Amino acid sequence: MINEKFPKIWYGGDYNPEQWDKATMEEDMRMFNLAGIDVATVNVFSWAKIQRDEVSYDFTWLDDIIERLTKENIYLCLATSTGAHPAWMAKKYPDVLRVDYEGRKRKFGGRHNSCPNSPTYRKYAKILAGKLAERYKDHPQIVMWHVSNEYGGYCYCDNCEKQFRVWLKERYGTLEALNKAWNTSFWSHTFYDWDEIVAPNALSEEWSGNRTNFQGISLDYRRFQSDSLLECFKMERDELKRWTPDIPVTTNLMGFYPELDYFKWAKEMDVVSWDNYPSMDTPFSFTAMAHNLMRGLKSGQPFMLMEQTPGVQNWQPYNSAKRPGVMRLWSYQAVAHGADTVMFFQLRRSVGACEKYHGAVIEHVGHEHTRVFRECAELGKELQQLGDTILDARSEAKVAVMYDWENRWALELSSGPSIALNYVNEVHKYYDALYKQNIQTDMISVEEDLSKYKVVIAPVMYMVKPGFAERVERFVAQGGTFVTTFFSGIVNENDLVTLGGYPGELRNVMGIWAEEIDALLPGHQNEIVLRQDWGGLRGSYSCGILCDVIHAETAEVLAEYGADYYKGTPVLTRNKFGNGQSYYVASSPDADFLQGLIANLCEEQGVKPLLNTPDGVEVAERVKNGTSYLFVMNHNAEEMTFDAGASRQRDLLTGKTISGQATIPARGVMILERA
Amino acid sequence: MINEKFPKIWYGGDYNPEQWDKATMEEDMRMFNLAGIDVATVNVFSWAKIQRDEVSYDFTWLDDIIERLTKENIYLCLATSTGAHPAWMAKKYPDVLRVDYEGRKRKFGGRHNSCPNSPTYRKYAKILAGKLAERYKDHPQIVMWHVSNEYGGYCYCDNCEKQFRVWLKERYGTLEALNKAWNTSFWSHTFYDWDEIVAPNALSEEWSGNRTNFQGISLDYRRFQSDSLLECFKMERDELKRWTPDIPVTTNLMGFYPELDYFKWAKEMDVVSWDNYPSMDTPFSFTAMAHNLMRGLKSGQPFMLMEQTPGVQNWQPYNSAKRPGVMRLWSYQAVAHGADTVMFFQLRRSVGACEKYHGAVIEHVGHEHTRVFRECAELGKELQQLGDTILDARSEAKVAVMYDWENRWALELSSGPSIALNYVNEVHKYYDALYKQNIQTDMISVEEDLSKYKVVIAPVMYMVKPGFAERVERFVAQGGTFVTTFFSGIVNENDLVTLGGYPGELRNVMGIWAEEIDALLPGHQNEIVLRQDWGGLRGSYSCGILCDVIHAETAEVLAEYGADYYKGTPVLTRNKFGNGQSYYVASSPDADFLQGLIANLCEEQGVKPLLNTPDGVEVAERVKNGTSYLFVMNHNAEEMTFDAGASRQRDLLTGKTISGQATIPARGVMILERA
Amino acid sequence: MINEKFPKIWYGGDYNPEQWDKATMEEDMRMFNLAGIDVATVNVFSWAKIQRDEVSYDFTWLDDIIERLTKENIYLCLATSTGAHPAWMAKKYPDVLRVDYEGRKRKFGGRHNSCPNSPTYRKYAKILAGKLAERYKDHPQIVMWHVSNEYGGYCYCDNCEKQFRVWLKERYGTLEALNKAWNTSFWSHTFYDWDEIVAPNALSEEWSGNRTNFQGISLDYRRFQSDSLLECFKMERDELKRWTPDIPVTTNLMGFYPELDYFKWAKEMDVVSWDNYPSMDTPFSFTAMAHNLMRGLKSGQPFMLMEQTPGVQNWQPYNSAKRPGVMRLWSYQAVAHGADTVMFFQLRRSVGACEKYHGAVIEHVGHEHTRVFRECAELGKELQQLGDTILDARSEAKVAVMYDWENRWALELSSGPSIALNYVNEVHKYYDALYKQNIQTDMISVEEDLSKYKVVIAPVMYMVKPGFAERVERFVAQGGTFVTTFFSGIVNENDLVTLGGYPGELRNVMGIWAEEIDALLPGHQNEIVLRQDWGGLRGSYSCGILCDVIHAETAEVLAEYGADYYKGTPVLTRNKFGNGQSYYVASSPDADFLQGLIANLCEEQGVKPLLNTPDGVEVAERVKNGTSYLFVMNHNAEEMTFDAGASRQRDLLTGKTISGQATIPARGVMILERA
Ligand SMILES: [Zn+2]
Ligand SMILES: [Zn+2]
Ligand SMILES: [Zn+2]
């Protein structure tokens, strides 16, 4: 379990009574009891309240809050408050403030924006975390540490620049090695001294947020910034554990957030927690893919849903209300994919600055006779009833899909071959296909152990890191199947091209040679024409975005282009390789083709759907011992019917036995317990 | 009259002989005479010409201009020249230059951009104003002072930041009060010293022009900037009044310009003057609303049209020629809404820099045989003919619609609930409905006395200021009808939410409780469904943008939503309150629904249309003594006919007597004199 | 010839073996012989490799490259390496870095971005040029000097600012003359000292690229910046010519690149060279016009095609592969319009940074068995077989269209009359009309000798320079036809309006007076209605963007507007003037009208198509001695057939005799040699 002393799916969220008074806190306790709320995330943004100058610390108000919540038997997710530095500190110690992408020195404002290489910031953040741990070391209600808050953003100040050079010295050892990695002979970029090197932003190598002259520099700086933030986190963590070695430590991540390499972060965290905030056009399968990734970060370990709105958001263009049931629906979607907590931002609405129109359990009227409140209490009852049932359950997926931040950085920094190529979109195209068929799958790192899987899919694996090619070769020869695509195997860890023919280190296992690649204008398409019927693939489908023009060397050709100067050349190939097979997909296909391909690939490895269901009804499974929990989630706004199978099983949410034809209400959820 | 010694609608405008020579001035005099031009606004932009260093003043060139115009008996609107500082001053005294929203120190260039807290600017602008007044104190031709020119724009420099803290001291008195007002417990923003507070711009709290982390700070900064600029105007005003206490002082405003609180500015001005420059998609009823607002800034006092182009604009994307008659049409529209002058920018085209392709009465050919000159001359004759007939005439509207700058600021900084909410558009939707039925209306401040009205409409009255609620409870209690909408009564003067349930202080009088609001995606609607036929309202209408979910408490329900999860809940309510009635409109309805709603509200109070006319034929009324003047303006490109009523009346522009059916030419104007 | 010792069309391009090693060079040499490559442009971006500090120069690596190429008898276009300064130089001498348009001091990065008024840059660029020239002065393989690389971009630094003041001193002599030229009495802009004048960028007079308060200042600053960069070129040129007085010097221009007055630049270069890079929506007639302009820069002298991709680009949004045959097609199109070289960027793909996905002859596989390579080898063989046949051949067009950078700057800076006015587009509309009918034309300076022409077309000649009016009066009177358009003859060289009536200095020769101009909203149109049938002009055509409202004075009206308030007024006039005729075109016509007008005008002067061909089949002629070479180029994806004429002639590319009907393959090229 996340914490043995708290044996259920935690229910609660961010709580900020220091924005109120003791009277309202009494109302909070009353209503939290009605809602089934038993965890509070406190002290996230009270650094200034605590520390008014470099020498004074007042924890008396916090003692009160903690003592009051303990009376109620509410557990504490205790934050270190380092998510936003005080105004006095920004004023006296400007080294704490970031210089931005546009080259500008910031003044005090906002949050999440301390320079991670700031001596002042590091000094005081470490001391604050240490004092909190020391003061509350012996307290029984603290069940989790919450370090800072949503780390992110880049800094380009002088301190980061001098520290970038050190990081470079440690990484490459010499200027010969550095100049080679960065290919500095290009555009007379030869460096003869480390101080000649600068941070890449609007002043130097970059423009428009994602464009650069020097991908090598831009890539490394992102590694460097991610590492620097990670060091701040590690620093607070170590200091916490000095005083409370037995209390878990987390920080709250942002899913597919692009700026941080979360695979590297998660190795440093006792458990992953994250903040799920969907856009109004975010596909339900996308947020599934994100919970999945969060699971994946520690190779299947259940994570905390640290934040989600219980109602409306504030920062979307059009902050629509969450329709009845949806709050519940989306909470159980998180649990289905590995969450062992569902926690909100936030418990009581602020009054406030920019978050006053962000949803909360208790809102502006200040009472419980509210739709949003009702729905929350309802979820709270259920979660109380589930108890420890699902806790620690894991995915036993036989299909994996690979994602990587460094690959993503190189791709997004690349120029070009096409701005229409979006890495996360292509990755999602494959995951979605799996999602619609209810094929249980894991999002994994390129580094993951491949032996649990029968199918490993790696969309646009543009960057191939040391050991990767050999791991997939070994995995395929042993009998696995590997899928990859156009613009894969192009470069190494430094974004230098692997010479001698794409896909380079994967050339042999894919059994094809990609000669050149064609980028299509928006709205232009080519067609995938099957050689002959093959499983659920028949006739023609369309494809777009990019078209690799390849040569089958060892692989069998299964489909070929139907149009353009490369008509009649392969677009889908299969290479037998030891006991396994590899498929190369040379274009970006429509959903029907991927539906077919995925079905074929799973059938070939004997992997079956969890269940067959109508479109919109998602199924995912977690397993505990030899017990299987099928989450069936109806995203449709109408009652729905599906075949739930004949075996004996019960819906954990209703207690009722289920067998055969079953219906599931609109926006409904069932948790099928079975062997 | 604006000035007794000048007893007609003033005609002329901005005039810049100092760009030319004496020879061209003789032609100028000749042509002004042809066009019936009798007023010139001079010396707007010659500070550097007057003052070449900190010690030298040359007024002789200005003496000759004033003397030459005097011989012609042309009246002088004399500007102070402070609307653009001299280059030598920017170079020697950089404190005069602004720091922009991006945090950059500006260099010399442009205009209207002096730092309002510059000691140098204030010093010299005050001396200049004083020297001018003292020099021309005994001149008979000067009928108006034109202070500076179009004050506007924000400054984020060091001096403003320091003055901002002082303004905060004067306003809140203590850090305790400021900390509460700004809700600084959020994001650890507690200030322990005033010096820790900074200007909110791209370096601190804000981004992309209208977004902010802390709207309380951003709201206050805009107040402070508006006051700061206002002080500069008051400074010059007082200096002018020392020497010429009997010459009126104005400064030229920009209508619905968002950055300045003109209601507060207007108290300090002897007469409002404004510059009307419509966009190519500006609806004619909007510019009517703008003129209307200009009249309302001083509670109905007539104003000056200080600027409008006689022909093309220069800064619109597409500067279309003003079709024949349109110039006249639009000048009379201004008069129709309270303009007692009609003035142009400018009398002769510059040659020039950025305004060489802005229209003028005298243009690049340098003669009067021009489409634009002929149209200016025609109007000139009519204004001579009208004499004092219309001067001082007032609006006697019984319908008022409220608009407020602080409300606006708070709304446009808010996040969100929807970027599709535009404060001014919502206001205009109500105005347009009255405009279309020729219901004589007043644009009014939230502070205006309500006693003279029967219908008060306050769209999106998000911010509710001290004394407002009482003021309106009393207006409804004693028989008035008050109309407000979704997202009203949410916050107070500091943008802090008023707790306990929307619409807060308006809850009592509105007799409803708004539980939650729903932002619709663009192109989505809900529907307004009437319980039963009510007056002009019948069946279903569409509504969109935002849908408020409300509970009738004291109010009764006249219509309910026709779709979505809040289908069948109130969207329109009527509350009997004392002798009067308040209507709550929970969404943003289409033009048809508002037409119905307006008619019913007017009928209910006994207010009738001025006149019934075809679409695009505008009718507005100004009353003088007991005499009524009906301005009738045909925006249509073809002849239109209407029934003018049976009472014996003459068109002042023709002398003809009108009764019953009457035709108006394309772009035509009539002014009907009636008792 | 470009260089007499190398008597064929040069084949090769940018070559960068310093990114590689001696061994890969051996492979370069083998493949270059296969491809028929005989010229390499070396040393473009190796400043830092040559010069590690302010005192050290290493040329040995370059010696090695030059020696190896000589063995293979490959000729050298030697660059000076000044296109990108070293990182140590940026670090130690920051005066080398630019200040950008937003006012920021840049840091080391990118290229083409040395401050042209940098003492350090000039000191070291000169020395480097000189050392290169002195070292290789006696070398037999050097056939061209390639100064720097793609000069461009503006600097707003302190040094440029102080030198701008000096350049103004030299140009105007007195503040009196400067204030007048800039019309500084506008907006109190009077300068009393040169140091009060600052550069026009985001901090002062300008915003968002092309908007400005003071076009005079903005216009001169671009002249100054163009001159500054030109001085850097001249400085290197002069140093090179000190040591090798008889080796040609060039620098690679960028065609219709807006920031530099290439007509001024070309007088300083021995031969023009340029870099042809189309957008995916660049019309084939546009790239033709660009080549044509490059020819026009030195009045018909053949130029060097210095760069073009042999395959894909890297900086286009969607970098599509060049379809089979297209590389060759576009290469011959360059030759048709005056290229006496065809060279690529680049010979071997970089590996790399931002250019690794830019095409090359030798690509990432590293061998010649590639579609792209085969196509390059094929072209190279053709070029070896052509020999010196076509060298020095020139255009004998009788139609010219004028283009001007200062005119372009003034039009792009103007506000407004319309942002839908795009000068280069209007220019292309005329050129395209000619290109579609295969009318041989020259793009020319406004300063070119008009004697050689029968039709001269000057679309939007908004700025009219000293001597221009007189030169075209003489041209028309002696028998030429002259065409200009709406919005011409408006200003002088200082962007000051020529008073008295548009089109000012052109008013006499055009025989019309343009009273006013009307900007149309996008999508809006008028119609051109012919008075009677006139040659290929019949009935009614559509027109848009701007409609000039004019009066015929001496000219007769061939066509009038068919709509709006100026319906019935002239839109197309003809003025008989001496033995010639001038046509005024008062609006922007559709392509049908322009087809008709062009045919009419050519017929009127005895000029006929080179050949009638189906659409997309382009024809251009170069003449050498008594022999005419007709380039026929089939832009269509399909075979095409046309009448090649009766005269006895052969295709240079096939050796075959062509007479009467001939068919051209898709993407095909024929070069007909005739009398
Ligand atoms: Zn930093
Ligand atoms: Zn300021
Ligand atoms: Zn410079």
Tab-separated table of C-alpha atoms and ligand atoms in Angstrom, chain C residues 115-116 155 157 160, ligand 3:
chain	number	residue	atom	x	y	z
C	115	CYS	CA	27.047	43.685	-36.160
C	116	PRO	CA	28.111	45.390	-39.385
C	155	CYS	CA	21.138	45.529	-35.887
C	157	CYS	CA	23.009	48.282	-31.168
C	160	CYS	CA	24.914	51.160	-35.251
D	3	ZN	ZN	25.087	47.036	-34.564
